[PDB]
């Protein structure tokens, strides 16, 4: 037959329904809300960071540690 003709109007309104505003809108709709999600990654990272700091580096070690077993007074000093 010549159906082959009659649908390509019918395909090419097929087209006209997929658009691309919907998925160019979308891109806008998130009004960069989704780039501050990537921002939490970061922000998660000195959270962290920011929150153990080693207990405020109460371990002892920022001390004399090397003065704590040796005092070093059977040298000049």
Do not use: F, M, P, W
């Not at 097929?14 to 009004?31: F, I, M, T």
């Not at 999600?37 to 004399?64: C, F, P, S, V, W």
């Amino acid at each position: 037959g010549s159906v082959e003709k009659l649908t390509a109007d019918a395909e090419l309104q097929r087209l006209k329904n997929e658009r691309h505003e919907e998925a160019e809108l979308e891109r806008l709709k998130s009004e960069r809300h989704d780039h501050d999600k990537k921002e939490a990654e970061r922000k998660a990272l000195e959270d962290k960071l920011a929150d153990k700091q080693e207990h405020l580096n109460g371990a002892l070690r920022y001390i004399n540690e090397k003065e704590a077993e040796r005092k070093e007074k059977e040298a000049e000093q």
